[PDB]
Subunit: 280 residues, 6 copies
């Protein structure tokens, strides 16, 4: 079992969680967010997404958290099988019911100024596959990671990050193959294609996760933030620019030049820009 209880502490205020677990590391700036429905191959129902959102949002807003490990608990108490996430659990009520609340989760992972590593501990199918795709990094169980894009089998499709963004990891030929055929791939296979960063022994998956997390946390958090947004930038168009530029704005705010401008507004005087040069 990848989960090492000794390493994790419950996060305050999340006692009511049923479909998701949420831990903070005993020492490191890292959290563990996991699907907690192993009986159903960790499929998400609307309540799961609600909880996932809440938890990830909380982790986004925690200034002492640098890295999110996104995984699935297991194994299944019914048949011993391992799953990361098998996707969606298969008049005012109607709009609130049919949701794409998962697309919001995808955006949350994409936009949060911290690194999200998906630890694929088992089946990653449909929406669960797409969650892995959108995470920044992926580490996968050698013995048990299974990647299967089953959307088209049931008449569904992720026409967004699940597919188009996958192509920016494995290239257009591989990505089209993954969706068009819906075959099952191992960790090593996906690693060879370029969607999985590294493969780890099943029982060491979270240990390797934590080691990756610690290497990320050992660097300047400002740089890591800028970096994530630089990687996102052009692919995400104006949104990519908005988030990168937003960090540039924050950096500028801290400078002497920007204090001068702020001062002179409050003091009703003209600003003096003579101390600060025109860099080229």
């Amino acid at each position: 079992n990848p989960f090492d209880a000794k390493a994790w502490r419950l996060v305050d205020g999340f006692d009511d969680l049923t479909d998701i677990t949420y831990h903070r590391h005993v020492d490191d700036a890292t959290v563990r967010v996991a699907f907690n429905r192993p009986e159903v191959r960790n499929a998400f129902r609307p309540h799961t997404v609600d909880e996932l959102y809440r938890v990830l949002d909380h982790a986004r807003m925690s200034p002492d958290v640098g890295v999110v490990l996104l995984t699935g608990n297991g194994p299944s108490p019914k048949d011993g099988g391992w799953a990361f996430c098998s996707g969606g659990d298969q008049t005012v009520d109607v709009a609130r019911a049919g949701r794409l609340h998962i697309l919001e989760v995808q955006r949350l992972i994409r936009f949060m100024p911290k690194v999200v590593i998906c630890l694929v501990n088992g089946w990653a199918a449909g929406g669960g596959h797409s969650l892995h795709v959108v995470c920044d990094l992926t580490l996968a169980s050698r013995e048990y990671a299974r990647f299967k894009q089953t959307d088209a089998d049931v008449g569904s499709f992720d026409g967004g990050y699940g597919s188009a963004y996958l192509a920016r990891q494995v290239g257009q030929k591989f990505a089209r193959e993954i969706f068009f055929l819906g075959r099952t791939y191992t960790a090593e296979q996906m690693h060879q294609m370029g969607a999985v960063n590294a493969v780890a022994e099943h029982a060491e998956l979270e240990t390797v996760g934590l080691q990756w997390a610690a290497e990320i946390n050992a660097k300047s958090p400002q740089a890591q933030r800028m970096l994530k947004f630089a990687f996102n930038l052009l692919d995400d168009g104006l949104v990519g620019q908005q988030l990168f530029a937003g960090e540039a704005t924050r950096l500028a705010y801290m400078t002497d030049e920007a204090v001068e401008g702020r001062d002179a507004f409050l003091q009703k005087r003209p600003p003096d820009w003579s101390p600060f040069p025109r860099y080229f």
Copy 2:
């Protein structure tokens, strides 16, 4: 005063609002969301942003609301001056920008006074803008104080007025009238100050009289390329929803639960 009290009721559950007001129209699928700090030219402080987010987010999830009217209350009790919003009280706001940008409803900015700094950037990111002829004033002051909106406020502005005018708006930081902004392409239409919300409601009614499904697809179709993968994600998400409703997708869902092979023969290969 643009505000017609008879047309609006408060939305239940928002009694604690201090910096923002939130009304639903008496008949129409339209809400009114307004800056409520006219003494400070409707500048937003962090608490203002929190409320604006919650309010817009509630509007987003309200299935019986089709259109958001985003405006500012006034005038100033202190000097009679009018403001839509003067920007930050001197990153939560980027979240608000994205909320407006991604919400599957049309957001109309009603610029009833000054729109400056972040307040200006809020108008730019809205789908449509109507502006008070007498009182709307557009001023991009960011560079004055050493700040800049390097996102929707600037780059997206350029996709409305073109690259020359947008550079000018930000580089010089001049004040512009409703009619000028209308010529440049950032203001849809200009209205008599007192009629601004009347015109807003009329525009809202025309938007709400159309297929809601169509309107949502269209918004996302306009966002799509500009917003890259996020734009694709949102438009494709709506396509996925449409596909779920079809007989073909029922068959695929059936056959999975029934453990049998799916039959695709009834459904043709459209070209």
Copy 3:
């Protein structure tokens, strides 16, 4: 020989074909489209392009065809050498590229031999590529002769193998095997020469066993952003088709013919 005659039937109406062959599978929703000039390493002359266009266009419009297998016949009767296609016989081809790119079905290139110049570019633009272990040979010779595919052949290759490999492939013009191209990212899988079309058929069957609607949307989703407005046009066009089938769109269409106002109340504002 990869070709299994028992598996294929000629398609009606194409008796006049000289440079290209065209078969429909005995059972499956799949066609076989093959260069038929093995004596000249399956190079295309203008008349080949004409036929290739007609044939691919026919396949595009055949509602009971889900997958196109694109390959080359052989071996050469003169020297026993194998070729998928060696390029132009030494702009109509750009049109064929676009047909392959825009058609709402999966095109698998089966590289059974040399794939050089334009023939290499044809492989690149297909959705998928399966290549003969023993005989697939990839060579971008364009620059040797003072020519260049500055479109899908090069820039799109880069979106398969990455910018360093794709530059390498064109700047040096070296010959690569199936396995090398598979390592690089341009070849989906390698198959024993004699089993190339058997594998192709198995791939085609797995593709055809899924929702045709989903496959169509997926293809256009993969093309979308890379193809800009054209990508959006094709994907959105499929969304439009999906919308037309809904109850909401029927109401809009009814109310127009019946001269009445439409009622949108049964249909919610999804978010």
Copy 4:
């Protein structure tokens, strides 16, 4: 009536046209392509699109034609009303849009009356638009009936009038005059109704007086980035053709046929 019969001759081979008319000018390298169902406000049915496609394709491949004038015949024999095209008779059309977009000739839309739905979208995708002052009426009705052009009709319109105006045009579905659309940026110029085709022909004459090669390159240069890989394919295709004509390309071609190594010494490395 904008139509001057003395200016135009029928094109050989199109006697069977029912829903479209097709003329070549008596002296100029200009054709006239027109919707010919004035009784239904020039709505296109599936047969209309077939004809429109064939006709436009023929013009594309006519080497002595430089400019296409796309318009509508009228007025209505039933009520005297004028129409360019009112859209679908209440996806072949997406092919026509691509034909207009990709053809290496300038297509000028002459909006002589109503331009609604798909008919509005056809105007948008043409390179240029001239509009009848008295009679051009622009109405984007799609969302009224639960439909939407999520491609060139909307996203490309935004690249003419900007994102604010474009959203307005679709969200509200109002009717706009020639001069309003001119102000917004989607109409190049307004003409007196009766002079519409005369102005059309003068614009065409100015276009045809320039280097055809340059006009080609320019159209694809304007298309390029908007159309992503497809845009690049077409612009680079023209660059390939230009390269083929050079002495350097001749040397490369010679040396392959002559089985010798090529000599690149005469041709310098430009920078």
Copy 5:
């Protein structure tokens, strides 16, 4: 005459200039760079481009210069005619385009006369354009002579005036006035001929009165997406510079030199 000699002093080190003049304002952080061949309508020959490059580069690297005013001297001593620049004397210019595009300062083109061919394209690539009411004439003649600017001259012009107007400007090659280009969106404002440089200086002064850091970021924010990886490279480069000045970045630099591990505890994870 727009030129006020009292306002300007020569820049040290440029006494060998023949085709270009280069002045620094007596008080303001503004330079005047001007074509100096009014006898040939300020056409640039390869020696002009050399000088223009050197001069613009010097202004780029001058830390006390905030704004470049680019213009043409006149009138012609032969015929009294005025010109900004008539293009190439009948690829070094593409380098100048990029120098203007990438320089972290605002370049204002003051079009005091004819701006044709390459001269038109220089105006298009500048950040802002102010134009002589009586004498600015914009004419894109390239296709007349079988040439074309397929880069910033055309594609980027479409990002100011929209795709319909930009296509018109190139395809017909008509002559436009200052006020027409102003209505289209390619000219920021129109000035009395005699006051063109005075208005230029006032605009410069308003630009120079704002945070230089902010203006730099803004320019690159406007260029960013349009310029793809180059746009990102420049904006990101400024972000890198900003980061270098922070306490966090000092800690990282210290710990490397001191061979110790860095401590990031003081600096929070902003969101």
Copy 6:
């Protein structure tokens, strides 16, 4: 030692170089440009960037040079360790990045040792990379010291190795071998350390054996979309050059000088 002295001669005019060396090959159209501070792991100080820029610029303008081999001299006389480049000595480098990116010749990085920080990023932006099996070490250390290359170093690396591997390279800052970077897609090929430049020269020779015109066009085709309007500028610039050489463009040029109307009748409208 990869360096074979007998193969290289110094370039005239560069005897003042301290931090960089610059050789022309004795026979081939290939230059060797090399960091020359092995004692500090070939880190670049501002004077190094100055020289690197001048040298690369000179190679760009050398008509008789087709390929630039960019590398690092060694080993360290202090410790025997090998380096390509260790980054900045602990924005002029962004200029060098652009010079490599825009130059109309293939730049091959020969990573003969450590390639860290800025030095890693130089290797990323080169067209091709060959790496020493035993000594190439790739390590993106930026975030360790609170820095980042948010441009080509990172976003362009993702278009070589894909988004997962690129994020990993930067977020963890681990050290990779030649073979690992080869598997990822950032290194074209791996060579025996002592054979590194020999293989470089052989790659160079294959590049220089093709049509330089075609190589130029290909490099810009690969850059194009990624570099937005800059990529279009450069590609289009080459297309303009090609057009200038044609008969059609001579005709347009003639008729302007001769004051006559041009005749376009000999030149057809290709499609």
